[PDB]
Amino acid sequence: SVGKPLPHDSARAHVTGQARYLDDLPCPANTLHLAFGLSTEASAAITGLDLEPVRESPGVIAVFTAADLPHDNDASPAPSPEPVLATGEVHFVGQPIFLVAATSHRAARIAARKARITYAPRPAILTLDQALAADSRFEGGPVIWARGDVETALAGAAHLAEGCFEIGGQEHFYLEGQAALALPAEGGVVIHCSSQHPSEIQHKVAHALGLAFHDVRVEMRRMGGGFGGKESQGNHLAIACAVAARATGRPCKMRYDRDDDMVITGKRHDFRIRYRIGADASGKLLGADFVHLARCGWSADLSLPVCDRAMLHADGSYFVPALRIESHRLRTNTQSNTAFRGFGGPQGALGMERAIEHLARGMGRDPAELRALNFYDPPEKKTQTTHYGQEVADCVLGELVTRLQKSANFTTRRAEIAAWNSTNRTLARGIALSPVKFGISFTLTHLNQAGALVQIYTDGSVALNHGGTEMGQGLHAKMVQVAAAVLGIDPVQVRITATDTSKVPNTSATAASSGADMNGMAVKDACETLRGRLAGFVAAREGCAARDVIFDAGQVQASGKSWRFAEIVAAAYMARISLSATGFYATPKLSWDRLRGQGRPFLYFAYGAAITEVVIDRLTGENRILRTDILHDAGASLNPALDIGQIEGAYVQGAGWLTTEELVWDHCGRLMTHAPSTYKIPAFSDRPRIFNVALWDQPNREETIFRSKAVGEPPFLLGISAFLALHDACAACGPHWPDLQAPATPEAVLAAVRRAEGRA
Amino acid sequence: MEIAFLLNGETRRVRIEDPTQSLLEWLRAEGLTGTKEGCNEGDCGACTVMIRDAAGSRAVNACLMMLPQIAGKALRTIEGIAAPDGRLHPVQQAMIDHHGSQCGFCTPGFIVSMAAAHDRDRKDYDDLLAGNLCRCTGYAPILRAAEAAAGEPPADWLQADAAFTLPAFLPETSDALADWYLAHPEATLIAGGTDVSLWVTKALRDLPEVAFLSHCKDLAQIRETPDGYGIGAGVTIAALRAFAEGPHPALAGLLRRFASEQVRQVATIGGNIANGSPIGDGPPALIAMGASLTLRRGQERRRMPLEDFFLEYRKQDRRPGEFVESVTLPKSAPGLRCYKLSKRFDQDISAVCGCLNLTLKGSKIETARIAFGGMAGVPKRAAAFEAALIGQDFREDTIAAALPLLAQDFTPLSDMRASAAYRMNAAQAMALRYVRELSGEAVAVLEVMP
């Protein structure tokens, strides 16, 4: 039923409160509960560790230290180790030093704080300048890519804008926290956990326990949100439970309390971006010189590919004849930053957007017009390439943006705001349009693979299993629709089973928006092997070619006769044909050199555009989004309803990142914003008062699952339009460049207002 | 100790041994796993449960509420929003229809919040669901769902709970409390629990000697006295906002952005005042409108200006064995305005909170009642700014001239909420705001058409 706006696979179960998340699962009466004892120091040696008051705390059954760990003490997804429990020294405020196994979740939590720890404090590395000065970084020096000669182009540039601005991080704030459960099962363990990558959980747990991979099994049914934060951060808990279960003999369960969750786990890499951008007398871009200062935290984690995507997307939506990026992946004594919806992409894009906005303002030109002038060309000379040298033969932005501007009534609205602004002096309106060009595929190429397993039972019903994990993006229904489309049956016949490493092995993470893309094909492959078997069985029985056997609407047709689907399956069963099949997919055409900054890392791009309108308060900096208009390319969408949902959601998260969401550390590396009381994600009323989401409906050029496009991450970047419109609102305060900083909090907005006004 | 209540349409009797245990924890231990834990801080609304009694029906946070409080009430969780026969509530179906869920984890909370809203035909969804955080959907589909289910009859099985009943001290009346607290000065008094329960869930504190004030009708009164309105300490913020709708639109307009609906329903004015927070939003409003506080030490009944109650940070003019009894508001205060400033509008505590209330004797400023929160460690009036404003012409330039005196009135603080500079700047910003508003100028961001 591909293309039909069907609901989410657990929509009713959600609504009835019958959907199980990890902590909802039933487990044996003797299930112990776990909690970490955290470092209160950003950079120190541990001189003394007295865990006596911890052991003597009520209900505590076991206490664990790095020394107690039977094998591996590494949780990082990177080739560089990251201790699960601190090894003689601590690297940030919140680093787990010890593990507590107690008979209740409260007991463990209480016991965790009764620690007696002495430190030998060392100098911390908290700001980017400190790291840059002390050379506290990863990859041994920066990564630099260049196309053409920026310095030459900028030297003879008819127009030029220089600048530099901060972009703050972002805490995921998935509603369900990090959580895992380990069940000892005769020589091996079974892990239930709230993770985006069950195959890596297996890997890390196996090494922790000194077991071969075939002794560890990860089941994962649904997550209460993930957003990238569960791509790796789950490792620490699953290891903790695996290790504690091995020692105590009992099942172990661990879930972070919200304050623990925000202190321990990483966030979105915050960036400082320096830019130099040059233009033509006509307005064509000559060159753009970028410098990325990225905060990676006390550990590698997934920083390497994160900053790689920041660079890859530093072109924005624009052809630049010469471009350079200098990428510093700096290490700081703060939380180890991780994956987050966009995966470094939104930072690189925003750098290009802030720059082109500044350039436009510098030459007194309409930013929309300038961007329009500088998009990549439509399909149908040799094709323009990106700065990393990939052909952009699918760029629809010229046409798309035009459509969106007319439907949103852009030109008229802009004028109407000009008038409104000139009648007001306390409140100012702002409107802006920002485009999206997001590449699709893991930049770590070999991860571009997926698997499926399909069962057809004698009653005609179907069990569908794949490697992708449901974190709320509607992946499961999409797969069901594919499976039902290929077999020629009603979706109701297809039941989704939980994600299981013993069912589909060697899976990648559910990330890079490739979940629907790759797994969709894997499902298709498995079903076509099944449909192929039944067609060939019918064909032989009825005497004819298998390609004449028609599977449609729960009915099979051959030789003018028609059976129900179930009637064929039972027959094929009686005939003795395998009604079980695997499916496998790997993304073709992908090849690039990470170091050289050259090649084709992506299969296709996902495009879109957003027009946002906002209002600001000149006295305080208070602000509201009044209306948004989005036109987004989901290819030939697999589920339009689900796809609208993803855009509405992603946009709000994107916008939220660049407004009320602000991470704050103290002078000691202590995160100050670690509760929902202090961290401010978009509330109900925060939604755009008018919200207009429409899909650009046009098939993919590349051969993807029913010519659809990955809609998972790209719409997150549409939140830039809000930050640009907030800047537009500042531009109508005075003649000066406002230099608005991200996130645009009330304080940040007031600052940029006063700058444009020229008030100290 | 034994209490009873109507859990999802069926009477349940519980043997309270731990009085501090939250309603969330109890329900999940019972296997009523549908109510989720999102934060355990009253912030996200994932644990939203629906209570009912004589007062009506309302949505509350299960994680904040402790068991003894639901005694003789009708509790209705997510697993009870659907009909006994299995038929889905108009709210539930509409959420499936309008794709109101994605990951699903915040759905139980919304459904309860919407069902309780549906039960009282309430429609201000922005305010109603402000206490409900969703990180997936963008809220847009949840609004459609709500509006689509609004054109439907109320659930009868939910309205059936109304016909119900028609270790920790629980006072019936103020007298009973006064006698007990007089002999027990070191006791932890619990009203709503929206501050006390954070000490147990987050600070991981134990509390011996406890009393619950939420079962004391004569403490929760809004009466009309010859001089004004004598509002009892047991009155909920949701109730105070409801009453102020008429007499004091400005306080009602401020209380809209107090916490959330799930918190306002159980949080009280006596609790907000007796907490003594420099970022507490009640006091700055009440001080600016010259409200008097009433304290009771059993039989002793001290009275004072509210501002005089707050001496220093973590220090109040409160005797041992003495409890906050009530406040008294004047019959009128037309010159009152209240500005709360924070990163986000809904469900976000103040950085600076300016309440201005000037009297005019025709162009000339007679009385200056200007109060601030978050500008000090104790809610206080802007002395020097107030003094230097008496007799002056009510115009911007005159106000603009006295603005610096606030830097001698306060020395703001810096933290994650705001920088000291900004707090100072925003305090002076609220003064220019006050003049512009009264001059009939557009100033409010929240009042702007899309």
Ligand SMILES: Cc1cc2nc3c(=O)[nH]c(=O)nc-3n(C[C@H](O)[C@H](O)[C@H](O)COP(=O)(O)OP(=O)(O)OC[C@H]3O[C@@H](n4cnc5c(N)ncnc54)[C@H](O)[C@@H]3O)c2cc1C
């Ligand atoms: C999610 C959330 C949002 C919040 N938002 C805001 C906000 O926007 N603005 C704001 O000002 N506050 C806010 N608060 C905190 C606020 O102070 C309390 O929630 C509430 O106002 C206190 O009332 P209560 O009845 O819950 O008091 P309780 O929590 O019951 O008690 C708090 C303290 O006051 C004492 N006390 C209570 N009543 C009396 C009495 N009658 N006599 C003597 N002592 C008494 C108690 O012993 C205790 O020490 C928020 C809290 C939460 C959890």
Ligand SMILES: Nc1nc2c(c(=O)[nH]1)N[C@H]1C(S)=C(S)[C@@H](COP(=O)(O)O)O[C@H]1N2
């Ligand atoms: N509701 C919801 N949608 C979501 C997320 C989530 O946690 N919840 N995470 C996303 C992230 S980070 C990725 S990588 C994906 C993954 O699913 P897909 O690969 O099927 O798009 O979509 C996004 N959409």
Ligand code: HPA
């Ligand atoms: O885009 C990505 N997302 C997550 N992991 C990755 N590894 C390489 N690219 C990616």
Ligand code: MOM
């Ligand atoms: O950020 Mo999504 O690549 O997990």
Ligand code: FES
């Ligand atoms: S769990 Fe977030 S409000 Fe109780």
Ligand code: FES
């Ligand atoms: S739907 Fe996933 S958190 Fe609201």
Ligand SMILES: [Ca+2]
């Ligand atoms: Ca996180």
